[PDB]
Symmetry: D3
């Protein structure tokens, strides 16, 4: 009946963090996380691409109205993450190390509480232009 | 026998359009398409990445000669879409809303009339740097 | 004294247009404007970088509060140009060809009506990644 | 038990090469490879994105420590390829045409000698911004 | 005579900060700095372009050996700023608000202590792709 | 009077080279040129931005017809440099080290033979995204 496609939107947020696990010693944390372990933290301009998939509406031509996607991303990414210190301002990271992997997972989870079932396809997080994580709910 | 790979080429074209469905009222169109419904239209520098897949030739080292891909894309994308008004200059859009989704579908279809069977893998269309559609023939 | 610096902000707007001069005939307009003379128009995702200059405030560390710069650009660029047909929705282009040069000049003039005297340093307009105009009020 | 994700790192290297097969005549090589057949060669700033996949560590939050990935890529890509003439400085290309396809294959193979089994997911090679090859070991 | 040219090198550093002035009160700092006044900070992937000018050497063809330029920038930018909290790890920012303007000024001053007299021409700092400051020692 | 503006056009060419001076010995060339002194060469995807300046025509709205600018650049840059080995295929580099500086100078000189007197304002050459030279005929 209807064609299926993937629709993506990109957004970026600014945040600080420090890679550190209290399960690891002061020295193991330094060895494992290196410079990212700097005691006072550091930061990034994160770029997030959220992809949803579904059938293309025969009337509107939309898999999902980009206005709605913007709103979901505002709620799932921008409000809790933008201009925040991940480890101190985001409850989820009080006990989870804020690697790019876990930021992708956190965003995936947040989006799932809001998006229609089966809509979310992928969450791609660029920590820098050179470090990227793709999480697809697996 | 032979290794398989995906080969992609990017091209960009300039076009104007207006998101509007005559199945929707003047006001519903405004609600659904917002600013994209501007009566006199607006435009974009579309970026299209076309991916074909196949075995890597044991002699030439090519999945498909990029010269041929350029030619197919010139014919399928540039000739009908570049420096055009999608809704008024492209017959296909006389009755289809010109969303990014439908531009990807249109390009996929165009390429299929020309490419060897099983060659086309994906058509990725960037309407802006922030709005992207991936269509894989599903 | 106080240190002087240049502060720039980038914005993108979507718009369509047709390069056409009523002073020229149908054949001249084609010769001069080529593919951009497409009767039904075409469009671009314009990127504009606005640079203002001045002294770095000794308390706030700002040449101009970027919040303020955003508002100025919102009023001078986004509001009148975003998602518009330059030649039909913008009075200025009624009798002025909408080349990248004239868009840069139009934006410069709009900002000058709003900005503090001497604040504006440069307006840079990318019609595409390859076609760029810089205007400095000269 | 544990979430799985894809982790990617990008690196770029500079290299010269000439597309030419001694199985093809002087003239066939010209027809097939065109400008890329220039007798004295030409060059590129290659961009390579290497993706590995696996479970996200419950303690460190890493699929693979980026420090390790950097080291593997230094060894598999940078040492043999950076600031080299592919056809004359890389033994593998003495008998294989240095197309983007074969550079991706070469890097995939190199990484396989070093990476833990099942870690490598994809090798994406940008010869230019417009010519890209994705090889996934198929 | 000898030809004169401008030679630029780009580097990126990761850092966090809070825009906050002790001269201002809690409410003023919020008014002035908005979201960047987040108590626990935030961060960016800063990009810095350093331009030096001078004569093109008649033997080496260099204005300055880029190896040398790299070292200068490594000492002036990377070492003191990369993976740091600007306001707590950099003495200069103890009593100077860390806007993009002051980061550009701080970098300019660091380079001036190291570079040959008259070599430095410009320091360009991108806090984000959209917020840019150019400092030329004025 | 007539308004004056700067019109820029970007092009990319692929080329290889070896940084080596016959005036220097084998050890000096290694010290000075390092990895770029690789005997068999290496290459880059050079990006060149050409800026011309002048009055904005009152009828066409152009400083110079971009069609014309394209042709000039095609003749001055693409034709002699694209898909070439700079030191063996370009006579100018027979006795001139092919640094980014000399490539910018060579391009400037080529454009000056073709362009209207006083039209050329700047030649910007990116050897890589990180190494840039600006030449203004000084
Ligand atoms: C980039 C640096 O500041 C830090 O965030 C860092 C260092 N090594 C890492 N390694 C992995 N696998 N994931 C990360 O997010 C990561 N992150
Ligand atoms: C971007 C804007 O000008 C307009 O083209 C627009 C607005 N909402 C949209 N929403 C979807 N899903 N797809 C679109 O192509 C789209 N397109
Ligand atoms: C780029 C093309 O589609 C068309 O808009 C066009 C043709 N040549 C041009 N020439 C100049 N000088 N300025 C332009 O904005 C311009 N623009
Ligand atoms: C880009 C050009 O310099 C040359 O490397 C070239 C020309 N045609 C090609 N075609 C394919 N399929 N793959 C290539 O790597 C390729 N490569
Ligand atoms: C960008 C935002 O998060 C914050 O850091 C901010 C607020 N407005 C600003 N305004 C100026 N002039 N400079 C800045 O660096 C600046 N920076
Ligand atoms: C970039 C590197 O591979 C090599 O080409 C190199 C070495 N140092 C350099 N130094 C200068 N000044 N200019 C160059 O073009 C240059 N280029
Ligand atoms: Zn980090
Ligand atoms: Zn649109
Ligand atoms: Zn146009
Ligand atoms: Zn090549
Ligand atoms: Zn900030
Ligand atoms: Zn080089």
């Amino acid at each position: 009946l209807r064609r299926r496609a993937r629709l993506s939107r990109l957004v970026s947020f600014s945040a600080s963090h420090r890679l550190h696990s209290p399960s690891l010693s002061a020295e193991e944390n330094l060895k494992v996380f290196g410079k990212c372990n700097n005691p006072n933290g550091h930061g990034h301009n994160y770029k997030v691409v959220v992809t949803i998939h579904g059938e293309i509406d025969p009337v509107t031509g939309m898999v999902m109205n980009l206005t709605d996607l913007k709103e979901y991303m505002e709620e799932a990414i921008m409000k809790p993450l933008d201009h925040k210190n991940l480890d101190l301002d985001v409850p989820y990271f009080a006990d989870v190390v804020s690697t790019t992997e876990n930021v992708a997972v956190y965003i995936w989870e947040n989006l799932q509480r809001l998006l229609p079932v089966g809509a979310l396809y992928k969450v791609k997080v660029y920590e820098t232009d050179n470090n990227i994580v793709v999480y697809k709910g697996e």
